[PDB]
Write a protein that binds this ligand. Structure first.
Ligand SMILES: Nc1nc2c(ncn2[C@@H]2O[C@H](COP(=O)(O)OP(=O)(O)OP(=O)(O)O)[C@@H](O)[C@H]2O)c(=O)[nH]1
Lengths: 193, 48, 90, 88, 86, 73, 87, 81, 49, 83
């Protein structure tokens, strides 16, 4: 009503992973439920102008964060970590194609709306949420040698004393070295505020 | 003077300690039944 | 291994939005507010007040210069004390 | 819109066999006119029936011509390749 | 091992004098001692020749062929313009 | 790794003047580019120092050949 | 073999390098980089048409140099011995 | 026809290469071609300003100083008027 | 009014339109592609959490 | 070799003296408190002497914080150590 520009920060994703323990597709459904609830009350505040101030992850004004472990990312920043780890990926178009009812066919290497190859999951799920779930599960579920092997396979290096830490502090260190700092939040604020 | 135990060992020790170990997960279980509440009730001459 | 960009390229990237003066290898120096930067030092400027060493003073808008022809670049003094220059000792 | 990649443009020019005039690198008065026959990843173009034209330094008109036949020019010596559209 | 590197290796093994025309307007008659993949060369008993135009009292005279002798020389492959094995 | 592509998406399909070596000017409309700054433009007009504009149509300039660029719109 | 390894084995010696710009610097080499960048101590440099200048040290990039001449007593056979491991 | 196949077919045959410096030409039997477009030729003769400077023999030329290359069969070294 | 799936694809095109047809390079995979989602100790890990 | 007061020679003959702050892999050097000195040879002819004297006049301009690409960088020499 005061027309201050508004951006969304979905918080406490560890509750999706560790409290609710819902599968990654249900995590996507929960995320979309929260985002549509926010946009629904935005639309009901002023009728007819809900499209002007739409909050949705593909625009870059929704930042998924877990503040206990201390990581935050947008879709653009997550595609940026893809572009850093592999190279030659258009971050803007990929972040556009990440969210929604977009399904990823790996054999055709394409984006559709129905599963063409009979088992293709969502683009957001397959590229974003299942890596986070696998990171969480393998960080709290593996011994220190297996953890060292896995995190070195991705490229994350820790001092050997830190591999034997408590699960919560080890989790914080692993997520800190994986996601990195809060640059995604800075980008979100600069672009949308 | 210091110990570290793997996840299977800690899980097994947690399972063996069932008759004693506490099943409370939520801290909101201790609403108005914590130390600060007892000290407030002591200072006010009331008893929860 | 992880690719490490240079500190000077990082200082160029952090100079966006402030007025800088870029002198190319052709003897022409343009001073203006930088609007973008790239890892290959291909910078685009908006204010671009150009002075050519033959004595040609002019003004242009939205001029992009590749890093190959760029000879020298001078940025604002505040970036002299930037967070990049601190020696991180972990 | 649809972007035109330089490799796609070179492939279209080779498939259409259209005439191309290339002003050389560091030489505004030196051009090569021919038909594109093949291209490589290092921008080295082999062109059949190539003719080298040296332009006049004053009036910027073609002064001398010499047909070198089917030749090959590296990408480092090529500056400006323009497709001369034939009057069909 | 089969292109111009083979010819350079053969010239180095034969210790035959070859003439290298360098893009700074120079010529070098020398025996090849060592070579690299980037055309970097190390040679022994090098005679370097050049043409210098003497300008005496503002008048450009006839050019003179100046020559110098170097025991060991190292020439980069970037500055090499032409090479001829003799 | 692979070099980053130049930021010229906003410059696509727009009137642009490119200054290239030999003090040459090209006024045209951007049609495409590459990672190595190989620019392909349509309706190109070449200008020498004499101020004469010669139409060429579809032209291509290499990354090393391109020196400066400026949007005309 | 790598000529950079030979140049590193040829370091700590007094040489004279003429660059592509016509400047010639003579002095004792202090360090040699794998990209042929050589830093020399007790340098005396002469540019194209300028008077010579003596400096304590001078670093020249591996791209700007044109031709280097070392002393005649250099053990070229010893410096050309293959010491790197076979890949 | 790719430039690599053209250079492979031009091997063991007379070719003329025009350099980028001094407008010099070298006509001779091409012997060896490398992946970096390094040329080694035999029975090479050099010409400067459309005038034959003379035969040199086995000539090794790097790709940096080479401007254009063509077949020497049916090609006249004199400049057309 | 303007759906994301409609502005990205176009009504009922389902697949991407062939004029653009964005594809990823062959190297690009999800980060923990080979690693399975759930170790046999993950139940125990969240029970101890 | 950082934080040492040095003078670098450009490919165009211009000298730049200042405190070297940072260097990169491609020798692109960022230096602060830069002073660009150009030694231009000028033939000054006196009104009484017919022989024109060629003097290397040094024109110095302060630039401040400047980053220079390594392709145009030629050589550098240390002037003064850390202060
Ligand atoms: N699972 C999970 N719990 C969190 C996270 N962040 C905070 N918490 C817990 O949630 C509680 C609330 O955190 P606060 O930082 O106090 O939130 P707040 O916004 O300051 O609370 P108010 O200012 O009163 O609205 C804390 O006590 C934490 O224990 C998180 O990222 N994940």
């Amino acid at each position: 009503l005061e027309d201050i520009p508004l951006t969304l920060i979905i918080n406490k994703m560890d509750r999706l992973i560790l409290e609710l323990k819902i599968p990654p597709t249900d995590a996507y459904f929960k995320l979309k439920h929260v985002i549509e609830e926010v946009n629904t009350v935005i639309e009901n505040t002023i009728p007819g102008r809900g499209e002007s101030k739409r909050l949705s992850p593909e625009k870059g004004n929704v930042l998924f964060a877990c503040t206990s472990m201390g990581w935050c990312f947008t879709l653009q920043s997550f595609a940026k970590m893809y572009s850093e780890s592999y190279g030659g990926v258009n971050v803007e178009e990929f972040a556009r194609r990440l969210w929604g009812d977009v399904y990823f066919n790996p054999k055709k290497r394409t984006f559709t709306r129905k599963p063409i190859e009979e088992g293709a999951k969502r683009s957001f799920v397959n590229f974003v949420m299942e890596p986070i779930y696998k990171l969480y599960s393998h960080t709290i579920s593996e011994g220190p040698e297996d953890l060292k092997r896995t995190l070195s396979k991705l490229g994350i290096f820790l001092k050997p004393s830190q591999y034997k830490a408590d699960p919560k502090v080890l989790m914080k260190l692993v997520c800190e070295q994986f996601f990195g700092p809060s640059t995604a939040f800075v980008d979100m604020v600069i672009k949308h505020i | 003077k210091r110990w570290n135990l793997t996840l299977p060992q800690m899980a097994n020790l947690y399972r063996l300690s069932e008759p004693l170990v506490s099943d409370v997960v939520d801290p909101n279980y201790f609403y108005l039944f914590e130390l600060k509440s007892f000290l407030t009730a002591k200072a006010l001459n009331v008893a929860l | 291994m992880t690719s490490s960009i240079g500190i000077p390229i990082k200082l160029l990237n952090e100079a966006q939005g402030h007025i800088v003066t870029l002198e190319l290898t052709t003897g022409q120096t343009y001073r203006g507010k930088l609007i973008e930067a790239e890892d290959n030092m291909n910078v685009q400027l908006k204010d671009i007040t150009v002075t050519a060493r033959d004595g040609r003073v002019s003004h242009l808008e939205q001029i992009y210069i590749r890093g190959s022809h760029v000879r020298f670049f001078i940025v604002p003094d505040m970036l002299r004390n930037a967070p990049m220059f601190r020696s991180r000792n972990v | 819109r649809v972007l035109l990649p330089p490799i796609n443009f070179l492939f279209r020019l080779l498939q259409q066999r259209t005439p191309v005039q290339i002003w050389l690198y560091e030489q505004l008065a030196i051009r090569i006119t021919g038909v594109i026959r093949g291209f490589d990843e290092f921008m080295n173009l082999v062109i059949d029936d190539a003719v080298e034209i040296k332009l006049s330094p004053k009036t910027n008109e073609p002064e001398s011509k010499r047909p070198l036949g089917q030749i090959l020019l590296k990408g480092d010596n090529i500056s400006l390749i323009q497709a001369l559209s034939g009057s069909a | 091992a089969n292109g111009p590197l083979s010819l350079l290796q053969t010239a180095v093994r034969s210790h035959t004098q070859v003439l290298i025309s360098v893009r700074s307007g120079r010529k070098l008659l020398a025996r090849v001692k060592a070579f690299d993949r980037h055309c970097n060369m190390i040679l022994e008993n090098v005679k370097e020749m050049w043409t210098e135009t003497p300008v005496t009292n503002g008048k450009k005279g006839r050019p003179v062929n100046k020559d110098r002798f170097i025991s060991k020389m190292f020439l980069r492959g970037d500055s090499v313009v032409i090479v001829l094995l003799s | 790794m692979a070099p980053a592509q130049p930021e010229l998406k906003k410059y696509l399909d727009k009137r642009l003047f490119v200054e290239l070596n030999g003090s040459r000017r090209v006024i045209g409309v951007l049609r495409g580019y590459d990672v190595f700054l190989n620019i392909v433009l349509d309706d190109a007009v070449e200008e020498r120092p004499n101020g004469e504009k010669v139409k060429l149509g579809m032209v291509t300039i290499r990354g090393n050949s391109v020196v400066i660029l400026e949007p005309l719109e | 073999m790598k000529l950079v390894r030979f140049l590193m084995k040829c370091a700590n010696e007094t040489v004279t390098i003429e660059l592509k710009n016509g400047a010639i610097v003579h002095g004792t080499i202090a360090s040699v980089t794998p990209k042929m960048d050589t830093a020399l101590r007790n340098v005396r440099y002469t540019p194209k048409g300028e008077e010579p200048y003596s400096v304590e040290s001078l670093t020249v990039r591996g791209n700007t140099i044109r031709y280097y001449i070392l002393p005649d007593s250099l053990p070229l056979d010893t410096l050309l011995i293959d010491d790197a491991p076979k890949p | 026809v790719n430039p690599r196949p053209f250079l492979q077919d031009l091997v063991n045959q007379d070719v003329i290469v025009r350099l980028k410096w001094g407008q010099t030409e070298y006509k001779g039997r091409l012997v060896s071609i490398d992946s970096y477009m390094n040329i080694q030729l035999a029975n090479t003769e050099e010409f400067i300003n459309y005038k034959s400077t003379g035969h040199l023999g086995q000539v090794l030329i790097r790709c940096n100083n080479v401007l254009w290359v063509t077949a020497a069969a049916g090609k006249q070294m004199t400049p057309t008027e | 009014t303007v759906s994301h799936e409609d502005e990205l694809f176009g009504k009922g095109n389902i697949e991407e339109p062939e004029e653009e047809a964005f594809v990823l390079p062959a190297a690009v995979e999800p980060f923990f592609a080979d690693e399975e989602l759930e170790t046999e100790d993950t139940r125990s890990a969240i029970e101890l959490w | 070799y950082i934080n040492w007061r040095m003078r670098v020679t450009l490919n165009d003959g211009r000298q730049m003296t200042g405190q070297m702050l940072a260097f990169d892999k491609h020798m692109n050097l960022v230096l602060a408190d830069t002073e660009e000195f150009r030694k231009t040879k000028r033939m000054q002819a006196k009104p009484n002497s017919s022989t024109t004297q060629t003097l290397i006049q040094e024109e110095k301009r302060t630039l401040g914080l400047t980053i220079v690409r390594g392709a145009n960088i030629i050589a550098l020499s240390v002037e003064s150590p850390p202060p």
